[PDB]
């Protein structure tokens, strides 16, 4: 991967309005529907269930698990079958010692079962920009959410982000450096969430001790439904174990930084979830194919004020199989059972907190963890990026004039080239020394076969067809051509067709800028230059397109006209 460091460039970006998070968001949501559409649909499973609590000694054990027998269809239409299964408490509701139970989504939305073969494991994916566009990467260790980044570089595609859906704790994220970051759109406004990034990872161990089994009961021709079978072994709760020394130590890093915004000596308490659906209230995360829901009350009961066993923390976690990711209406997914005992071990790299508010000020401050939206899981990683389009047609005045109408070498070792867009922070004279660097990259791959060279392998997009990224690539390769040919068409009317630098006869008006040639070319970057001339750049493009190069054509041939 080629990453270029820009010298003397102070480009700032706003994390909250960053357009890269919403594109991924709509990208994952579109990706999910493209995977569940080909899978089998459990429309016949919405049938009155007759459930009997699973074999357990009631000491209170208040098992959520049920054992329900239902009249299910089979391969033949006239025939039926009475089969049983197991369902947690969260998946079934009572319909007014076995009683009648109903699947939770039957009254609201249809349900469809995720294919057993597809894996929900997050893999790193990098997002790049199309040919003719650039991505600016902040390299400031102490970088705030919004503001100038003193050290900026550029890269084609971002380092891959593992898309991990996490409600209360960010999982397997990028570690911060030195002090932990407290990024917020407005720390004073409670409505905006408080995103945190850890510098030291907190390991977490989650398990489902119940040794379930998978039972495939054919329910349609070519269609098979997967239900939980007999549970082997002790009935136990799903739990997550986090070491208290490390969590107490990290929690001490977050509380120290928070005092900078609210004062040195103030009450900083941590509290529990204050309400919401089962998603927001618990640490909803996926592991091994199932979806845990952990009460985090043991992590977030503490009180800090001013200054001054070695056993782990255990979390009771519920498990649900019927879920509507991202609060979508009219849709539901049934995750198939996972045979055997499963273990989870991940790293905690960030939290999503909330301001409590209230009328009292400077008396007490409590932070309540929450997971209102999944977009905040993407802002925790796309914070250091920004998308920009490069514009290569910059005009400037110079005493050089057009070759008279009546009229008709160093070979290498140019020094200290800066790479693509490396001269963006250098002077206009120094930046004008490297023009083929950008002109190479305006079209096709910026580096190492970046895009067009890649789309050459066969059956990559043919098999892909229009699914997912297949339409993303056509819009990225067609827009690249349309922007390149736009500048060439601008030259075709302006003269200078094969020339990177052309001077044509057009007078530079003094009202556009009162600065002299020296001061402009001595110590100015082309970026600052495009700002002042931005008000007049359209007019220059109108005088230069015809009066400069079409008056010549009308005169140039008249000159040779009979």
């Amino acid at each position: 991967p080629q990453e270029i460091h820009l010298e003397n460039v102070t480009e700032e970006f706003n994390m909250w309005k960053n357009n890269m998070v919403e594109q991924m968001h709509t990208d994952i949501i579109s990706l999910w529907d493209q995977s569940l559409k080909p899978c089998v649909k459990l429309t016949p499973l919405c049938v009155t269930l007759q459930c009997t609590n699973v074999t357990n000694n009631i000491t209170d054990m208040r098992g959520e698990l049920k054992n329900c027998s239902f009249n299910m269809t089979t391969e033949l239409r006239d025939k039926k079958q009475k089969v049983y299964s197991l369902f947690y408490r969260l998946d079934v509701v009572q319909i007014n010692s076995n009683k009648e139970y109903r699947l939770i989504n039957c009254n609201t939305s249809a349900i469809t079962q995720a294919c057993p073969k597809v894996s929900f494991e997050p893999i790193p994916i990098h997002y790049c920009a199309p040919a003719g566009f650039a991505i600016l990467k902040c390299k400031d260790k102490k970088f705030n959410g919004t503001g100038p980044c003193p050290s900026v570089s550029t890269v084609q595609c971002t380092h891959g982000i593992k898309p991990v859906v996490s409600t209360q704790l960010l999982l397997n994220g990028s570690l911060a450096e030195e002090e932990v970051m407290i990024r917020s759109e407005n720390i004073t406004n409670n409505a905006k969430n408080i995103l945190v990034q850890f510098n030291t990872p907190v390991q977490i161990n989650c398990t489902r001790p119940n040794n379930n089994t998978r039972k495939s009961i054919r329910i349609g021709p070519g269609q098979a439904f997967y239900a939980t079978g007999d549970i082997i072994g002790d009935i136990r709760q799903a739990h997550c174990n986090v070491s208290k020394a490390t969590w107490n130590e990290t929690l001490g890093k977050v509380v120290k930084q928070l005092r900078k915004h609210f004062g040195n000596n103030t009450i900083i308490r941590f509290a529990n979830s204050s309400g919401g659906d089962l998603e927001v209230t618990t640490h909803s995360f996926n592991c091994g194919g199932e979806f845990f829901y952990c009460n985090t009350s043991g992590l977030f009961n503490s009180t800090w004020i001013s200054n001054t066993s070695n056993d782990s923390i255990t979390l009771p976690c519920r498990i649900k199989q019927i879920i509507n990711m991202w609060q979508r209406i009219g849709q539901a997914m049934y995750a198939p059972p996972i045979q055997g005992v499963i273990r989870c071990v991940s790293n905690i790299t960030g939290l999503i907190l909330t301001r409590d508010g209230g009328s009292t000020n400077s008396t007490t401050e409590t932070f309540r963890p929450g997971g209102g939206d999944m977009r905040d899981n993407w802002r925790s990683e796309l914070y250091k990026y920004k998308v920009v389009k490069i514009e290569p047609l910059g005009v400037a005045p110079t005493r050089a004039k057009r070759r008279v109408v009546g009229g008709g070498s160093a070979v290498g070792i140019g020094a200290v080239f800066l790479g693509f867009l490396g001269a963006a922070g250098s002077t206009m004279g120094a930046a004008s020394m490297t023009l083929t660097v950008q002109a190479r990259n305006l079209l096709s791959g910026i580096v190492q076969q970046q895009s067009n060279l890649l789309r050459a392998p066969e059956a990559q997009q043919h098999l892909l067809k229009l699914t997912v990224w297949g339409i993303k690539q056509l819009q990225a390769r067609v827009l690249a051509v349309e922007r390149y040919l736009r500048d060439q068409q601008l030259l075709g009317i302006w003269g200078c067709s094969g020339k990177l630098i052309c001077t044509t006869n057009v007078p530079w008006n003094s009202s556009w800028s009162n600065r002299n040639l020296s001061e402009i070319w001595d110590n100015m970057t082309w970026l600052q230059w495009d700002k002042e001339i931005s008000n007049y750049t359209q007019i220059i493009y109108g005088l230069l397109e015809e009066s400069q190069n079409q008056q010549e054509k009308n005169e140039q041939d008249l000159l040779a006209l009979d």
């Epitope: 407005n186 720390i187 004073t188 406004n189 409670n190 409505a191 915004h261 609210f262 204050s274 309400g275 919401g276 659906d277 998603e279 927001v280 609060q327 909330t354 508010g357 209230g358 009328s359 000020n361 400077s362 929450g370 997971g371 209102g372 939206d373």
Partner: antibody, heavy 120, light 104 residues
Framework: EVRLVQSGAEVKKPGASVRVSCAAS????????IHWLRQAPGRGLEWMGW????????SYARQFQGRVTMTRDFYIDTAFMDFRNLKMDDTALYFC?????????????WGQGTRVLVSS | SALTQPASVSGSPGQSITISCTAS????????VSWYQQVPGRAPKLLIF???RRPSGISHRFSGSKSGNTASLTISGLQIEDEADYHC?????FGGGTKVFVLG
């Protein structure tokens, strides 16, 4: 054509734990957070809590912790507010409002209000 | 009331009168204010959401600016329709209301 519709006036003895409904119409309900504000006759407006439709997240004021609880339902585009253990001091008009499109702490749309009086 | 508002204001029709919004010495990040025109006993009406920006349905006569820790609202060409209860809010904090009186 966006307007919030509240519940009707109700009277209750202390400890009665009244709930109020706020109906949303004319816009995508699942986008903006809903706020509950109460105004006494001899006092200014007071902010009680905000709850957003996606995920039900809710933040409650310090003095209303353990006393109030807010939820919502996407199918009926309505946010509810459960105010348990009501007191004689808490009698006033209850408004539910939505923040403006500018996303700053401003309220562009309101409701007709509900009258809640506690007495013996 | 984390902030405070003037108890009563009085002025002749057509005269410009200003309203203030106090700030505590411990206020943090006081960067936005929205004013409201609440009919006594009815739903409030948003006069300006941001410090200076105004909605469409609100007249041009209503204006507002912030200097230091004080927010100011000025009315020009006062009419009786304008008489109501006014409130300035910063984040969740509100004010006790500003009584208005039209003379005579």
């Amino acid at each position: 054509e966006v307007r919030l519709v509240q519940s009707g006036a109700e009277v209750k003895k202390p400890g009665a734990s009244v709930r109020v409904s706020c109906a949303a119409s004319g816009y995508t309900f699942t986008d903006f957070d809903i706020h509950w504000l109460r105004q006494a006759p001899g006092r200014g407006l007071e902010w009680m809590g905000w709850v957003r439709p996606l995920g039900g997240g809710v933040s409650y004021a310090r003095q209303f912790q353990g006393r109030v609880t807010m939820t919502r339902d996407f199918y009926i585009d309505t946010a509810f507010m459960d105010f348990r253990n009501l007191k004689m001091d808490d009698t006033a008009l209850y408004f539910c409002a939505r923040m403006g499109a500018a996303r700053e702490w401003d309220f562009q749309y309101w409701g007709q209000g509900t009258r809640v009086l506690v007495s013996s | 009331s984390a902030l405070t508002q003037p108890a009563s204001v009085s002025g002749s029709p057509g005269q410009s009168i200003t309203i203030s919004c106090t700030a505590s010495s411990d206020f943090r990040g006081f960067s936005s204010v929205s004013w409201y025109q609440q009919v006594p006993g009815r739903a409030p009406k948003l006069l300006i959401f941001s410090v200076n920006r105004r909605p469409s349905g609100i007249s041009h006569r209503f204006s507002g600016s912030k200097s230091g820790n004080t927010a100011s609202l000025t009315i020009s060409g006062l009419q009786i329709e304008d008489e109501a209860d006014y409130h300035c809010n910063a984040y969740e904090f509100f004010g006790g209301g500003t009584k208005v009186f039209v003379l005579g």
